[PDB]
Amino acid sequence: MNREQVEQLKQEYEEKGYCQIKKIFDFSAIKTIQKTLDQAKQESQISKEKVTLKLGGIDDIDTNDHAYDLVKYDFVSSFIQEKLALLNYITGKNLMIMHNALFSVEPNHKGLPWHVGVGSFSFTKTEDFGASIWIPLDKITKEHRGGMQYVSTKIFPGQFYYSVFDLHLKNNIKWDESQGDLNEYVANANTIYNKITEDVIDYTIKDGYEEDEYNLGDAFFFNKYVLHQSVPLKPGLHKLRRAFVIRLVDYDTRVDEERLGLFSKYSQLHSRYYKTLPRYNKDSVLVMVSRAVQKGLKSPYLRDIPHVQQTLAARMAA
Amino acid sequence: MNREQVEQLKQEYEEKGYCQIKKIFDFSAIKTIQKTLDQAKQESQISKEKVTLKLGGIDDIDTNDHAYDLVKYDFVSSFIQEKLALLNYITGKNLMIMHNALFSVEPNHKGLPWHVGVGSFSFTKTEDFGASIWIPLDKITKEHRGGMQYVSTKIFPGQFYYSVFDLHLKNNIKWDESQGDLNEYVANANTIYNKITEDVIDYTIKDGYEEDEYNLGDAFFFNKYVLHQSVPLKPGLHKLRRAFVIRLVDYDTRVDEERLGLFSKYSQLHSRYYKTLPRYNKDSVLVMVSRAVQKGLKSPYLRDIPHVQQTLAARMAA
Numbered sequence: 001m002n003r004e005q006v007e008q009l010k011q012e013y014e015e016k017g018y019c020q021i022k023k024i025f026d027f028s029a030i031k032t033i034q035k036t037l038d039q040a041k042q043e044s045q046i047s048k049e050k051v052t053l054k055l056g057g058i059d060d061i062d063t064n065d066h067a068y069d070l071v072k073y074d075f076v077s078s079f080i081q082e083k084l085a086l087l088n089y090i091t092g093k094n095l096m097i098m099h100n101a102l103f104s105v106e107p108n109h110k111g112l113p114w115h116v117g118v119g120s121f122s123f124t125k126t127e128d129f130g131a132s133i134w135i136p137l138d139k140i141t142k143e144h145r146g147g148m149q150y151v152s153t154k155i156f157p158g159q160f161y162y163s164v165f166d167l168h169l170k171n172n173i174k175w176d177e178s179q180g181d182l183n184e185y186v187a188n189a190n191t192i193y194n195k196i197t198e199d200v201i202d203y204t205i206k207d208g209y210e211e212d213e214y215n216l217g218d219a220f221f222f223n224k225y226v227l228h229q230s231v232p233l234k235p236g237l238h239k240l241r242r243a244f245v246i247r248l249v250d251y252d253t254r255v256d257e258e259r260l261g262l263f264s265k266y267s268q269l270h271s272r273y274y275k276t277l278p279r280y281n282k283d284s285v286l287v288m289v290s291r292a293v294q295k296g297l298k299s300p301y302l303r304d305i306p307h308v309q310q311t312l313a314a315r316m317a318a
Numbered sequence: 319m320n321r322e323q324v325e326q327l328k329q330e331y332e333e334k335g336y337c338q339i340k341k342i343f344d345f346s347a348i349k350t351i352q353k354t355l356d357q358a359k360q361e362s363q364i365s366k367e368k369v370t371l372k373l374g375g376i377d378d379i380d381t382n383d384h385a386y387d388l389v390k391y392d393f394v395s396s397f398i399q400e401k402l403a404l405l406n407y408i409t410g411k412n413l414m415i416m417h418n419a420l421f422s423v424e425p426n427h428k429g430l431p432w433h434v435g436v437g438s439f440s441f442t443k444t445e446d447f448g449a450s451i452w453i454p455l456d457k458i459t460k461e462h463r464g465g466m467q468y469v470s471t472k473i474f475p476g477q478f479y480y481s482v483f484d485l486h487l488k489n490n491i492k493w494d495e496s497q498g499d500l501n502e503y504v505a506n507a508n509t510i511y512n513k514i515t516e517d518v519i520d521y522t523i524k525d526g527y528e529e530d531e532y533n534l535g536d537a538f539f540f541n542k543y544v545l546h547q548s549v550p551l552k553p554g555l556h557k558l559r560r561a562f563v564i565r566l567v568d569y570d571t572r573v574d575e576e577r578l579g580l581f582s583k584y585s586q587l588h589s590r591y592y593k594t595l596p597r598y599n600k601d602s603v604l605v606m607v608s609r610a611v612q613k614g615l616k617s618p619y620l621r622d623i624p625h626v627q628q629t630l631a632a633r634m635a636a
């Protein structure tokens with residue numbers, strides 16, 4: 001790239017925990033992502049419960065598509081691997097491609113509320129590294145928005161939010177028939193997590209968030225402590241706005257068996273009460289890790305999971 | 319000591335972040351502490367503002383004595399140094415004696431509310447080590463209580479509370495004449511810190527806290543992530559109940575210039591508005607560190623502060 005720009009990127013990420021990277025993908029790569037995800041999406045039937053659970057059972061998710069791991073690591077490296085070098089440099093970390101998600105919003109919807117990636121990076125240790133590349137597949141303009149807002153970690157160091165979220169999950173799991181409807185129990189529980197409403201976030205952050213326009217080819221890179229949300233899409237430009245998101249960890253990132261257990265139990269409890277049948281795309285990263293854990297782990301590191309170890313070269317820089 | 323007991327102590331601290339240590343001081347040491355603190359206390363005139371600020375300006379402190387560093391490090395090592403070995407072993411850390419406090423409560427007062435030592439260990443980095451020895455100078459019984467309650471870090475990992483508190487301090491410091499009375503501004507600000515009320519703590523913790531009886535000679539040892547509070551003293555046993563508290567850090571504990579600055583600014587702002595004159599006992603640890611910082615620091619470590627480095631032997635195990 002420019003070199004001068006690359007240094008500004010590194011600089012900005014070091015200050016904020018994020019950076020918008022303009023023109024990182026070529027239009028041809030975008031079109032390939034669009035078509036491929038469009039095909040993958042037509043094939044499977046997906047529900048709102050796994051994104052709801054991921055953000056703690058709060059049920060304020062207003063998104064159209066919430067699909068995890070529709071495509072595999074190989075399709076992803078095929079356009080991401082050549083970029084890992086720039087990201088490794090920006091973060092001073094060695095990145096491995098892991099899991100992905102597709103989100104979309106229709107006009108006049110809130111999409112996802114303010115969050116940090118405690119749901120996305122649930123099966124990994126809080127203090128270990130995690131970051132995301134958010135690739136919008138429909139243009140984000142000043143006039144129609146529909147993109148994201150995001151807050152410098154200088155303003156909102158999101159690492160503390162993980163404990164708060166774990167305390168809340170722990171409460172979820174203490175639910176009882178006596179309690180009444182599970183979802184209402186979770187949403188009204190007097191947990192610290194529930195106290196942190198949008199007004200509170202607003203008062204905390206003020207105007208310190210940033211919202212940027214994106215042309216196809218641009219992406220947003222951010223670590224898992226960055227507080228962020230979807231912005232509503234105004235009608236008249238896109239019927240729907242999609243974004244494809246790649247989750248990356250560090251070579252040394254470790255599994256967190258304890259949170260993984262909390263999520264499973266909560267998921268289990270929710271499916272049992274609501275009589276639902278959670279579907280996971282074959283080769284979903286979460287499923288793969290749960291099995292390795294259920295068998296018992298030899299190593300703490302994600303890299304030493306058998307499927308990962310075998311496919312490691314494709315997951316990392318050349 | 320017993321050896322079998324010492325292993326239970328180590329075990330318990332590893333689980334909970336705390337342990338009650340029975341009969342660690344002899345009655346003679348206690349009487350010496352009583353007399354010495356009684357003398358030191360008669361001499362100086364102390365206000366409620368520095369404990370109020372330390373817990374974020376909330377003004378729910380209901381204690382009689384809130385005095386910091388009434389005595390010096392040498393008087394403290396004279397009864398503490400011989401115990402550092404047991405504490406170093408329990409925590410697997412090398413402890414340095416640093417600063418101290420005297421708290422007392424009259425019958426039917428709430429003393430201090432639930433807190434973690436973000437006020438006590440304000441000038442040190444969050445992730446660096448801090449712990450306290452709480453030495454009650456008046457007997458704590460099942461019938462009159464007046465002691466403390468405390469929560470396992472397994473139940474409430476208090477490290478997250480430090481960020482929450484720092485976000486709140488940052489808000490304190492954005493106060494304006496336009497805002498109105500500073501204390502009311504701080505107490506009503508819609509900060510995450512203010513959302514975490516007693517009801518919320520109660521809902522989070524449940525009955526998971528522990529309250530123990532203490533005879534003179536017993537003490538409570540706890541790290542700075544442990545959530546704890548004063549319990550009311552029922553009348554008819556003591557006119558007043560005192561406790562002397564020693565704060566310890568690790569040999570490798572570092573100064574946090576940023577929080578130190580926040581506290582100073584907030585303190586400054588509060589004194590300016592209320593026309594108050596903060597007094598600090600000569601050789602207060604906070605004052606000593608502020609000067610070293612204001613001069614500019616050569617090293618990040620507390621040990622490398624000049625006064626500390628000179629007096630290091632007395633601060634550490636033999």
Ligand SMILES: O=C(O)CCC(=O)C(=O)O
Pocket residue numbers: 103104105111112120132134147148228229230231243245
């Ligand atoms: O695409 C969106 O609106 C939200 C995406 C998101 O939260 C993420 O990629 O982590």
Ligand SMILES: O=C(O)CCC(=O)C(=O)O
Pocket residue numbers: 421422423429430438450452465466546547548549561563
């Ligand atoms: O003595 C009391 O009631 C409270 C003491 C306290 O909070 C401490 O020693 O950290």
Ligand SMILES: [Cl-]
Pocket residue numbers: 115116117118120
């Ligand atoms: Cl996320």
Ligand SMILES: [Cl-]
Pocket residue numbers: 433434435436438
């Ligand atoms: Cl404390």
Ligand SMILES: [Fe+3]
Pocket residue numbers: 115116117120228
């Ligand atoms: Fe997200």
Ligand SMILES: [Fe+3]
Pocket residue numbers: 433434435438546
């Ligand atoms: Fe305390």
